[PDB]
């Protein structure tokens, strides 16, 4: 191919001639070392290149080679349970091969293993007309996840040759007779991270996702193919939420993305995820997870394409017919990487120094998520659920990153600093937060549970809102200025906050709560309210009720710790409440 020639090295900027055959946004290897660069400008045969590694020691005369493609990702068998960076460099392979704890400058390693032998099981017969998305076979990459080999986009013709066998991702497995002629296919396909993968049709996300987090699944639920934003101050619990969602969501595959990130904070995901095991399968969390781990030390191009690298992978398994959940922490540090490039490209700055296309980039990202009909004859359905953490300065959400995010998403989990200092976690503001899936979800819930669940959530929200109104009266006038009915509502609302909204992510049992356990728990909290309400109407006094319900209220608070196999020990509280209140 064509080999460029450096004519200028100025900081991170490198100029090179003999680049007439190059294209814009192409990834290049700059200098003798072959460090990573990207073409940003082009004039005749002089290309302007941004280098995202140290350019120290590089000068004119040294060669420059183009990879013939923009920033892409290798998609095939051997991608699951791998830890990449923003530009999809195999971090594990880097430590095993180079035998060092560092990232060698100018070291090129393939993302996937190109020597490993996978058994390809052909499932399609020859003479069949194939199009993009059509499944020609599969590979058992994990015990549960079936890696389905699909026809790459742009390929359309007749299947000539195909057979099952043990191949690498380089070996040809299928030959398609096209209009051009013969085209060989392999188990791997390339795709640019900045381009969204084609679909057959976009659908509405109406299926609720079980996260195990009570405050989330009950009051502010997100659907499969939905999008949620988690803004807040530092130390509010953004990351803990991202963790809890990643390891409990009823989803086929998880794509976690460090944007990002703090050095000693990235360590947590890397070490903790391979240590978690689903009791049903005996498999580790990583075995259904593709991790993108970026420290702040990583190249800015990798930090900027971090969420686009992840969602491209998420789209890949989405087309296969799986439900994928992609986590982003933190998008503010992704936007900061975007802001850095804006200044380096010397563009006209928008709001707060961010590029003027910030709102578009965020829109492009979230509109690539959702419930879709994947390409292919099967017309199968897949989804991508995007959950992103936002880290605004001082917790002020009137900043560009948050506002532009809330404009394209429907779920907003606002973190409150005053709540985090009360050890009230997750610190989600039940008054300020919202979910535009609430009505549709409650409809789904009522059907699958055969309960009046949607009325329970509504009443639950009504009590919390009445609490807010009453608390102002408790501040202006005395606490003894409320009627017994007002005193009861505050006690019921207190139970909702402490026994339900509050959820310890580090407790062995409280870390997760299934859909049925949430129902029974909310049932006994509301049951206490109803019975005590009726009791007051029958002449009973407020103090007499509380003094005689110490034991049963004690049993309510600990209901969050009741094991999932003993859900009847939560349902039995309903009877104890009635009998206890009836005695009074």
């Amino acid at each position: 191919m064509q080999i460029g020639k450096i004519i200028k090295v100025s900081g991170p900027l490198v100029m090179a001639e003999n680049m007439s055959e190059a294209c814009i946004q192409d990834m290049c290897l700059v200098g003798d070392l072959g460090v990573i660069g990207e073409i940003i400008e082009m004039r005749q045969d002089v290309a302007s290149i941004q280098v995202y590694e140290e350019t120290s020691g590089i000068g004119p005369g040294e060669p420059v080679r183009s990879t013939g493609e923009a920033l892409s990702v290798e998609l095939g068998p051997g991608i699951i349970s791998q830890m990449f960076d923003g530009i999809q460099r195999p971090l594990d392979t880097f430590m095993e091969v180079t035998q060092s704890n560092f990232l060698g400058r100018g070291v090129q390693l393939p993302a996937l293993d190109h020597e490993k032998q996978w058994w390809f099981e052909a499932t399609i017969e020859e003479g069949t007309e194939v199009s993009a998305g059509d499944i020609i076979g599969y590979v058992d990459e994990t015990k549960i996840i079936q890696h389905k080999i699909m026809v790459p986009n742009g390929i359309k013709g007749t299947v000539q040759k195909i057979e099952s066998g043990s191949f690498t991702i380089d070996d040809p497995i299928c030959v398609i007779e096209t209009e051009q002629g013969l085209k060989e296919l392999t188990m791997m396909q390339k795709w640019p991270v900045r381009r969204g993968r084609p679909i057959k049709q976009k659908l509405n996300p109406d299926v609720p996702m079980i996260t195990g987090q009570r405050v989330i699944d009950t009051f502010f639920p997100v659907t499969k193919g939905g999008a949620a934003a988690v803004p807040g101050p530092f130390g509010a619990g953004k990351t803990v939420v991202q963790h809890q969602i990643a390891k409990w969501s009823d989803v086929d595959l998880v794509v976690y993305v460090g944007c990002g990130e703090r050095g000693n904070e990235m360590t947590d995901v890397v070490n903790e995820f391979p240590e978690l095991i689903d009791p049903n399968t005996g498999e580790s969390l990583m075995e259904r997870t593709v991790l993108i781990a970026n420290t702040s030390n990583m190249p800015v191009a990798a930090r900027e394409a971090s969420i686009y690298t992840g969602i491209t992978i998420a789209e890949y398994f989405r087309d296969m017919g799986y439900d994928v959940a992609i986590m982003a922490d933190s998008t503010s540090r992704w936007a900061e990487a975007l802001r850095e490039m804006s200044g380096r490209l010397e563009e006209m700055p928008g709001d707060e120094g961010y590029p003027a296309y910030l709102g578009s980039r965020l829109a492009e990202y979230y509109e690539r998520s959702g419930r879709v009909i994947a390409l292919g004859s099967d017309q199968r359905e897949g989804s991508i659920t995007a959950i992103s953490a936002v880290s605004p300065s001082g917790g002020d959400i009137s900043e560009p990153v948050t506002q532009n995010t809330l404009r394209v998403v429907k779920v907003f989990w606002g973190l409150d600093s005053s709540l985090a200092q009360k050890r009230h976690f997750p610190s989600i503001n039940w008054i300020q937060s919202y979910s535009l899936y609430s009505t549709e979800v409650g409809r789904y819930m009522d059907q699958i549970l055969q309960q009046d669940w949607s009325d329970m959530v509504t009443e639950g929200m009504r009590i919390l809102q009445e609490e807010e109104q009453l608390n102002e009266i408790v501040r202006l006038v005395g606490i003894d200025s409320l009627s017994d009915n007002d005193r009861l509502t505050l006690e019921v609302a207190k139970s909702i906050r402490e026994d339900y909204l509050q959820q310890n992510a580090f407790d062995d049992v409280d870390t997760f709560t299934s859909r049925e356990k949430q129902f029974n728990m909310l049932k006994v909290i509301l049951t206490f309210g109803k019975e005590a309400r009726k009791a007051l109407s029958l002449g009973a006094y407020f103090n007499e009720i509380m003094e005689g319900t110490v034991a049963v209220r004690e049993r309510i608070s600990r209901s969050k710790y009741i094991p999932e196999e003993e859900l009847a020990k939560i349902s039995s509280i309903n009877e104890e409440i009635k009998e206890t209140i009836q005695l009074i």
Binding site: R43, Q44, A70, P192, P205, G350, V408
Partner: protein, 454 residues
């Protein structure tokens, strides 16, 4: 003779440079054929000598300077018009996206359109019964008027949009509105809400829709209103239809315009928005009105969300300077469960003079228009101090005003998102909406209509 240049000189970011060209004009539309078969639309921003600086809609990412072709079409951005646009759903550039029979357009029209001669204009005076009393009485809409709705994120302006589309029509006439809807830079689920509503009500069978999404190119978001208006002026000034145009969100349009401006390295004006924002928006809203000797009309209802609920923001401010009035939606009303949450005090209509007394109501309720304005003002000043402090200055001259508000916002202004009321009903309820204020309080010129009904 088909023109195509295969050598690109320079690509700097989103901008391009093509040399050795001739006969290339300003604002000319171009096409770039990628090496993978992809075709991208572009626009000639500037021409010097044998050179042409152009901008590509989908960006210049992945473009070679030796293995690409740039076709110059010899015409600006156009729209394919026909008799069969009604019932169809189009792109931001006028391409079918509803998977029906593709239409063979009769002709192609410049989406910039042409400026109506102010002498040839026919001043709007035909009353439109929107059904909503807050609009119909106090901020009256007229056929040919440009009357926008100023709202905020989370507020039911989408519900108000669909409502008006359902029940608005001209009195004592068989004329039915042909609705041209234009979604601008909104999400899929936002766009799906309109697609669903238009199908259930059957409004799709009498409408043209131009759906532009949020992750569509910024240039396409800019082109969408001009695409819709070209279709509107076509159906009106060539088919004789009375077209009702509804656009949302105009805030997205302005943000797209700001992004494009910075990409062209133009110096930002006030609050970082372009200096030509007034002019640019004026090339859209002035497309409304009527013409002498020509049947049909064009009525616009722009919709925008005010950033941080600030009315002094460039987007609603410059909109207010151009359009003939505005309808304001506030959260303080919406929090009271009011739908629509219309605040009549910041609201206005500039063409309500000839619309009133002609279509309605011979000063029957045209006259009380300035009273409910002036009375609700003091009714709010009174309610402000009487709530936070003690006994009002007067329970007959100062707290009487408070009585005429609370219910006359929970009832007089309430209405309903799927509820339709006639003007007669509105002027009926209105005389009953003065509940309860004595004959001392109504300080108007007449004693006639104070006796006919309560």
């Amino acid at each position: 003779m088909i023109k195509e240049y295969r050598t690109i000189k320079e690509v700097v970011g989103p901008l391009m440079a093509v040399e050795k060209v001739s006969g290339v004009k300003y604002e000319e539309l171009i096409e770039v054929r990628m090496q993978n078969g992809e075709i991208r639309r572009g626009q000639v921003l500037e021409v010097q000598e044998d050179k042409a600086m152009v901008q590509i809609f989908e960006g210049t990412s992945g473009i070679c300077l030796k293995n690409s072709s740039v076709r110059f079409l010899g015409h600006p951005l156009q729209l394919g018009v026909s008799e069969d646009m009604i019932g169809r759903v189009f792109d931001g550039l006028g391409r079918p996206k509803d998977n029906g029979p593709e239409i063979l357009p009769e002709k192609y029209l410049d989406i910039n359109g042409e400026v109506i001669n102010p002498i040839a204009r026919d001043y709007p005076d035909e009353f439109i019964q929107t059904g909503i009393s807050a609009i119909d009485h106090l901020n009256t809409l007229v056929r040919g008027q440009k009357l926008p709705v100023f709202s905020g994120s989370g507020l039911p302006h989408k519900e108000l949009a669909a409502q008006i589309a359902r029940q608005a029509t001209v009195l004592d006439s068989s004329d039915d509105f042909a609705v041209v809807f234009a979604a601008i830079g909104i999400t899929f689920e936002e766009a799906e809400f309109f697609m669903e509503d238009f199908r259930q009500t059957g409004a799709i069978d009498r409408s043209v829709m131009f759906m532009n999404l949020a992750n569509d190119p910024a240039i396409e978001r800019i082109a969408t209103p001009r695409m819709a208006l070209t279709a509107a002026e076509y159906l009106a000034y060539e088919k004789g239809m009375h077209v009702l145009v509804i656009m949302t969100d105009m805030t997205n349009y302005a943000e797209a315009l700001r992004e494009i401006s910075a990409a062209r390295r133009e110096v930002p004006g006030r609050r970082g928005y372009p200096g030509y924002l007034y002019t640019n928006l004026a090339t859209l809203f002035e497309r409304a009105g009527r013409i002498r000797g020509l049947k049909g009309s064009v009525t616009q209802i722009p919709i925008l969300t005010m950033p941080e609920d600030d009315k002094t923001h460039p987007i609603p401010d410059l909109t207010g300077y151009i359009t003939e009035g505005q309808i304001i939606l506030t959260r303080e009303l919406y929090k009271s469960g009011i739908q629509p949450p219309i605040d009549v005090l910041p609201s206005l209509s500039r063409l309500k003079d000839k619309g009133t007394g002609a279509g309605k109501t011979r000063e029957d309720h045209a006259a009380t228009m300035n009273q409910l304005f002036a009375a609700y003002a003091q009714g709010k000043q009174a309610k402000e101090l009487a709530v936070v402090l003690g006994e009002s200055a007067l329970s007959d001259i100062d707290k009487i005003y408070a009585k005429f508000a609370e219910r006359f916002e929970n009832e007089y202004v309430n209405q309903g998102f799927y509820t339709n009321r006639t003007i007669t009903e509105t002027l009926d309820l209105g005389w009953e909406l003065l509940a309860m204020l004595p004959r001392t309080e109504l300080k108007r010129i007449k004693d006639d209509l104070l006796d006919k009904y309560l």
